[PDB]
Design a protein around this nucleic acid. Structure first.
Lengths: 134, 134
DNA sequence: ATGCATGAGGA
DNA sequence: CCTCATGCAT
DNA sequence: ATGCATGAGGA
DNA sequence: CCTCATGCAT
């Protein structure tokens, strides 16, 4: 049976609180999941978990693995600023542009088409985090 | 004879440009200064150098050491947001408060006195960077 | 890329 | 205390 | 703490 | 192409 979104908030809040009190960094925890359970994770992922900056499914996948570490540790190419806001505006107009709208947006802002395609992919995926940028 | 501030801007701009083209990260360069010259530096320091976020003296100290690497590589406790703006306001009023103004500022914002003393130390020291936050 | 930190050295 | 060079952790 | 990225897997 | 989990580099 799955946690609620409230369960994950409170778990993340208490996980961070306890990780600090034990004297571990985010990078430490991520490495220890590799050491103890053969499933390493980066500082970036532990940080996002604590901020709920991951999808609900991802949050649910990591929670028991982080609960394991907690139980166990208790025992011891750059978009300009002006261009960035332009990408926003079109994202509210339409957040999933075609490969044709992307390729034209890339010239009107003088970005490579791949840069724009990936930027939209990422901005769509932040919208799906449990705590999105809004 | 010492570089001008313009010399250091252009050197930092060209250093970053060349470091990327060689395929090295900031952390790589910092470690290589230890490897090659027995003077290791952190990713943080290389990053600040490229952004001129260090004092003129510091910038001058690091430049020849980074010019060495370039020549050689060519061959191969958290202040709330609202509280933060309050610390600013008083910094313009007076940027070097006494240990008595510090200790009272610490209670009126419910921070530890050491936190406020260190915050002022750091905010004074950013004012001395070649590219300050302003 | 940066917030908060440390410690050597000095008035 | 401070300045100052410097970095861990995020 | 996060901007830009990759690659496995799927419609 | 996309979604999605994930991280290097800053």
């Amino acid at each position: 049976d799955t946690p609620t979104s409230d369960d994950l908030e409170q778990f993340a809040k208490q996980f961070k609180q306890r990780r600090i009190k034990l004297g571990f960094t985010q990078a430490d925890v991520g490495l220890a999941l590799g050491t103890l359970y053969g499933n390493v994770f980066s500082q970036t992922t532990i940080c996002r978990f604590e901020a709920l900056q991951l999808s609900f499914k991802n949050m649910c996948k990591l929670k028991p693995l982080l609960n394991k570490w907690l139980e166990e540790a208790d025992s011891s190419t750059s978009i300009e600023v002006s261009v960035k806001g332009a990408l926003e505006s079109h994202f509210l107009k339409c957040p999933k542009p075609s490969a044709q709208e992307i390729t034209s947006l890339a010239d009107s802002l003088q970005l490579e088409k791949e840069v724009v395609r990936v930027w939209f992919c990422n901005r769509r995926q932040k919208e799906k985090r449990m705590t999105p940028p809004g």
